[PDB]
Design a binder for these strands. Structure first.
Ligand SMILES: Nc1nc2c(ncn2[C@H]2C[C@H](O)[C@@H](COP(=O)(O)OP(=O)(O)OP(=O)(O)O)O2)c(=O)[nH]1
Ligand SMILES: [Mn+2]
Ligand SMILES: [Mn+2]
Length: 175
DNA sequence: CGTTCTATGTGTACTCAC
DNA sequence: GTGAGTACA
DNA sequence: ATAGAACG
């Protein structure tokens, strides 16, 4: 069920105004500023296996509800797997079935989440390997030295990459 | 000593014993 | 409930 | 990125 970069962007553009979740009866819309395209789509690969969306949820209490009660106005989908942090959907788009992957992160995690979910995997592996040799650990939630969050005065992914000590490259060029 | 090749990470969701 | 183990972000 | 191993 493969698709083009253009089809990818069409769908993401369509979902951007339509994602919401049920929170104890009421239907809360997810805001565009908290929807970030990730994976191969953000890396502008000509062909994609799926669409990967990162949702930034504004508080920890809400994690229990967003993905497990995710809603998409006017589009039929089925749920393959679903937990608080990762959700996989099969959506119907123009009489065709496409795979939509949803992930979640808290605001304090945004740049780590983006850095992780942008990929590619081989780039994650090598960046992390390097940090391990200097006794740091990195993941989707933060940077670490001996079980402790390194507080970093940074907001964007670019700021994080440069803080970590690596060449910043646009997603297309990461490898 | 230099060139080149190779290997490498960290966490989530689900299922199935006991 | 906990923990082993697979599949896979 | 980086470091070890095989090769020159
Ligand atoms: N596949 C995979 N992805 C990971 C892993 N760790 C972090 N990720 C992140 C980086 C990936 O780009 C992102 C989405 O995974 P996908 O498997 O959808 O791959 P991606 O979109 O790069 O390419 P594709 O979907 O294959 O066109 O999740 C991992 O171990 N495996
Ligand atoms: Mn993908
Ligand atoms: Mn994916």
């Amino acid at each position: 069920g493969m698709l083009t970069l253009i089809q990818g962007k069409k769908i993401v553009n369509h979902l951007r105004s339509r994602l919401a979740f049920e929170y104890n009866g009421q239907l809360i819309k997810i805001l565009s500023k908290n929807i970030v395209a990730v994976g191969s789509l953000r890396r502008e690969e000509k062909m994609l296996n799926d669409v990967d969306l990162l949702i930034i949820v504004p508080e920890k209490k809400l994690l229990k509800h967003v993905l497990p009660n995710i809603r998409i106005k006017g589009l039929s989908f089925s749920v393959k797997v679903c937990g608080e942090r990762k959700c996989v959907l099969f959506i119907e788009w123009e009489k065709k079935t496409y795979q939509l992957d949803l992930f979640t992160a808290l605001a304090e995690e945004k740049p780590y989440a983006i850095f992780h979910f942008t990929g590619p995997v081989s780039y994650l592996i090598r960046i992390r390997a390097a940090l391990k040799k200097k006794n740091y650990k990195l993941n989707q939630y933060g940077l670490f030295k001996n079980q402790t969050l390194v507080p970093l005065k940074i907001t964007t992914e670019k700021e994080l990459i440069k803080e970590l000590g690596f060449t910043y490259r646009i997603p297309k060029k990461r490898l």
